[PDB]
Amino acid sequence: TCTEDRIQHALERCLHCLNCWSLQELVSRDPGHFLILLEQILQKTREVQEKGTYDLLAPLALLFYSTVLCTPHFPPDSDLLLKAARTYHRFLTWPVPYCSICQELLTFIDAELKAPGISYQRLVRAEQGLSTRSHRSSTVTVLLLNPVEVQAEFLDVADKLSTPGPSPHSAYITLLLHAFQATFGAHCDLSGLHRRLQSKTLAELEAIFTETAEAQELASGIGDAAEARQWLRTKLQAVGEKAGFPGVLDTAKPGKLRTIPIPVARCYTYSWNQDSFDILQEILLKDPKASTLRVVVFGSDRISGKVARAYSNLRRLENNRPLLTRFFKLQFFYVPVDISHYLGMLDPWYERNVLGLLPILADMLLYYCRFAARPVLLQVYQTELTFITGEKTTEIFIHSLELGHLTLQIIYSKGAISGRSRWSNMEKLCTSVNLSKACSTEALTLNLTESTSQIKVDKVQIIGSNSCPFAVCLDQDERKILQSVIRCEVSPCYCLPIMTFS
Amino acid sequence: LIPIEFVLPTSKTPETALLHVAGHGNVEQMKAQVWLRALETSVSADFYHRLGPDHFLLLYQKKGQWYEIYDKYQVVQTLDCLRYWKVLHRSPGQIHVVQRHAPSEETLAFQRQLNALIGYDVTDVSNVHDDELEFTRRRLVTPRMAEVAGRDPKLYAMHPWVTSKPLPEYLLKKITNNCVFIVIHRSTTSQTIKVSADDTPGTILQSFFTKMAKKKSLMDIPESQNERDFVLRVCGRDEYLVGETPIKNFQWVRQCLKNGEEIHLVLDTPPDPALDEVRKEEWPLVDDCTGVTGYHEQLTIHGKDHESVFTVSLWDCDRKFRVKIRGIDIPVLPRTADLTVFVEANIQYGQQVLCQRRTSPKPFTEEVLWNVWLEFSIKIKDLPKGALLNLQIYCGKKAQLLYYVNLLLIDHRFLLRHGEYVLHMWQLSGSFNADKLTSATNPDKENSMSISILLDNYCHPIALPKHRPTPDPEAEMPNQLRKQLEAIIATDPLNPLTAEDKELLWHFRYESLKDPKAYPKLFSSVKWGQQEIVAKTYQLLAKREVWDQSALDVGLTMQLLDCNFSDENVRAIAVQKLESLEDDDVLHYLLQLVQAVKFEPYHDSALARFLLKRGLRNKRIGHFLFWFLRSEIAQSRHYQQRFAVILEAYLRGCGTAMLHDFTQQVQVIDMLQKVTIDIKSLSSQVISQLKQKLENLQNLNLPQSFRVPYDPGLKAGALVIEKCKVMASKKKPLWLEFKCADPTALSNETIGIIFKHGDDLRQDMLILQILRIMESIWETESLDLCLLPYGCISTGDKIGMIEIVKDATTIAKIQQSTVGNTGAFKDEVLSHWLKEKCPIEEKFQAAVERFVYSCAGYCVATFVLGIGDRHNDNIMISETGNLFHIDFGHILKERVPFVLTPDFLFVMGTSGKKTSLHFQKFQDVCVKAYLALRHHTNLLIILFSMMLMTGMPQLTSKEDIEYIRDALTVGKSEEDAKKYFLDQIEVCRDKGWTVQFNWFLHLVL
């Protein structure tokens, strides 16, 4: 159809920015679009399954895992899930990690077939935190901003997101309406059920919601999905009867299926003038897997790295004194306001959606925060500094170093990918020892001010002139300039990661 | 699941634990389950907490024999224990668990002894990135025990030598009235008895006892000890005459008759079988099936839920094979010159390059990092077993080839290689050589150019199926096509096959299958790049009645083992055919088979096991096998590990006495080699120092007895210090002269040896094998060329032992005797020397006849092998008029065919262009031999090609094989060959001394 053709065109234009948001809006107008869209993907997906072009695989996956998670109802006549299952069941011959993506999708598809709507209910229940006793889990959203660095538009976005729009009563209303719609198709009058619920108290609503979620999970646990679906449909009919509103359901005449946009999760905003993340630890006073602290750091290069320093710092602090994990299995999300550039070069999807940066920006932010689910690590260079008085300290840096404004003992072990530790000693009198991050790891190009010259290194040691104190910088930071240093070792070292789409 | 019970070390009685295991679970998962259950069930759980699961092995009995569940990644289903129990209706399973145990000090001492004998440690695991060698070592255990069980200690110890071919006609002249005289030396008596050619040793001994039953006293045979306790033995040598075979069927008797020498034998008690014990095996047998993965039905995924997927059949995958090349690093440059260097990768099956790809050239340096992906057009499902992923580093300005390295895409146990890899690349020393197929890495991991690659892993192993040869149901051909096809089949082995012919053969392959000779040509046409064709071919080979009924043809079977064919079943049927060969033919072809072992893609084959069995079943073959392999280990760094494994798997079953003999021989050779190296490093001083050193060696532990390498029946004794000396040569060999340690030796002749250093002999060893094969052919043709093979051998890097032809002088010396050092070559010199050495005219005539024979034989052989351009300073002649060559080590723009100097013409008397009876006899014999030989063009060509491939180190090109073909005059009438050979003879006659004189000048220069 013309609308279907436009859907395909928009999807194609996306594959090659705001295309994602535009597509989301377009599909959100009619429930039918969903199925239509899901068809086109399984067409294009199959294409790659033969052409063996790896790159396009990762984006489509997300789109699919997005589209299915938003559709309101799947008529039992529709078999599109079987088509997806068969299409993805033949990817296991693919290399790693694509097989991981396909395995996760297979698990998700089995879940959906057994008991539709499970994924939506789980996501919303975790987001709003109205979790059941058997499955007690929650979610958080923290927006750390530097008012000056973060532009006024970003500030408006954060303020809007921290706005407490919804209420738990509305959460129960939406969750029950969505579950019944998805399960019973159009044979229910959502208006009548909504009217009956609006009179119902919070306690009874929550009890019914908990029971419905328990029935959902139980059905998802059943072996045969075909029988499980009917079993759960009957159970929900019995639940509606017992509560006292069965009439709205099962209506012989179908209604008009309604799209249910995902709700808005809790959000709290804090100023973060400091580049030290410790601010968060304070809010702690104010289970790891039961919830996560989706810290949302606004991203500026200059400070990007200087704050990454803080991140890694507290990373070590908790790795040695794990307490934050006991509360939340943390997750971090950078937000360009070159830690992004690296992500984009590795994962182009990120480069085209996150790096490009309710209002369009807010929707994009929500989407990104909710679907980017692939932690990526960054390379980093550990070092140990021994001072005049025998004091020894361990530091970690990623940008560069500056040692000087002397008879510097300079030893270094260049390396080969093959693994040839070509040691070398250059005990030369130098003044300014500037480490440059030239760019499978890499080699900082050590610099020296004697006739100048600069060369790469892999693992280095510098010894001063008979306990000579030499100033050392940290990633160009003129604030933290350690001194009284006599010895300096440098070498590359290897839940709270740098969340990326990957 | 699978209910299985595991016995447990801890007792008051050994504990048991019944367990259910995944039907398709592997051994690792089962081990984890067993350890976890034991941690709970254990009466003393601390005992099992202290140790890990790896500190125990799983031994289960099968009819009484413990087998160990070795392969930790094999699937539980393939285990033969389950199948055997089902046959036995034993359940739930019973698997004893035994903690590891450190090897006994005795075991360590024995292991070090074997390492010393081999000359290279086998237990090392340094230059390896796999487990194939240890796995093969454990695998080979079963054949050793099986063969040892079925061996008669008596005959095994006596190891009589026999054969079964008909007597050559000329030799039937010597035997008359079907009887011959045998001399018996006993104590101090010599009695001659006439016995028919068809009287076995037992019958002859019984008849002799009956004759002399009244006179045992003089014979000095105790009355108690009856005939049972005495058997014949050849006087002066350790070779017996026992068994049940006509007296003419023992090689020694035929040799004596050929030599015209009265047969002498002496009674002696049987050698003790107890000396042949083998140390009780120190290992449990490894399970039966390890190299079988299953049928494609089970290993595929379609029709299975992903949660129930244990493995992915390789054929299911259908992408393009893809690899990632990271970089190349070398410590120091190879040269100082700006040259672009690019890596080139290829996929090769056999010698056929399935596909190629090349990278980007870059300014060469010590380090060059690419990190680039290469995708071959070939899909993953069409990877045949044994494919080689060749890698090369072409240094451009064509681009020189600097290094390379091979790699098996599929490892031994049928699991696609996956993960990271760091290889060490060999360095180059034509078109092809046997070196490029080495699967090993460079031991010098310090200063050897190394490369790094990456192959994408998978969430599961990608195994390979095993074919399910379900019968194939798959009329008459046009007669013209039949004629064309047959003509194609009739071409020479080397004749290339066009695409059209290949398609025809494959299309009409059921036609060819009805003809054995077509087999080698039929498999070349097969396209290896498709799974479907492979399946069809295996179906074709399933029906193998025609090949089986085919009479054994060694020449044909050799063609199969060439590198062309890397199929599992092709070489299996070839070995099957070889299984029928008797012992003597094996002695003939042993060196060529050992060479062919190189081409086998994997460490364990059918060929290796066949060799092991034949060696263990006999002594003599075992001896020669030992020396050949030991020579291979020392030299060829490419394959030292494989031969080391095979030889170790051997030496553990030979026995005791054999081990002691190897010990003594190796010690003596090492001492002499050390002295030789010390001496050659630097006049009469040299001789005095050598004699002093020999005296010291006597003062040292230079054993007094040892079987000579190239002649096990001959026991060397104590050196004759005075008779030794140093020859005058650019390499200065040593001249040793031992004396036999047998007190019963008839004569006092010494045992000569020449000990050469600083030169490889393998070329000479191979050429001598070729000459022996040719001699066998001619004997089958009922002639006598009186060729002179002598036993040469190599026993290390540039060290060799050579038999000494007694009473033998080079032709150059004879020339110097009269002419001196000018260059003139009078023809009367050789005749005068021979006549002087032969005062009796009858002796003179016999010597002339033998001289003509040997000259003809050697001329033919050298011409056939195309090495007849021998300088006039490498040919020897015996006082008996016999002639022969030596020094086949340097020979591997006029080009004379072969040396037929005019002096030979004078010897035969027909100087100039005149002729006489002698010359015509020479020509007649030459032509007879030449045609009889051309009757085996296939065998000659295949052996020569194998020699070139696995012989000289430098790269070889088809030009050599082109020449060889040309020479024999393949596919030409008998008269054409006669004319061609006579033309060669006349060309040799015409030139005269010109070429040899030029050679003399060049050597002087």
Ligand SMILES: Nc1ncnc2c1ncn2[C@@H]1O[C@H](COP(=O)(O)OP(=O)(O)O)[C@@H](O)[C@H]1O
């Ligand atoms: N099998 C043999 N029996 C007796 N003498 C031999 C034998 N082989 C070589 N010689 C002697 O060794 C000398 C040739 O040595 P060789 O190493 O072949 O040549 P070169 O002098 O070029 O090194 C000759 O004097 C020859 O008599």
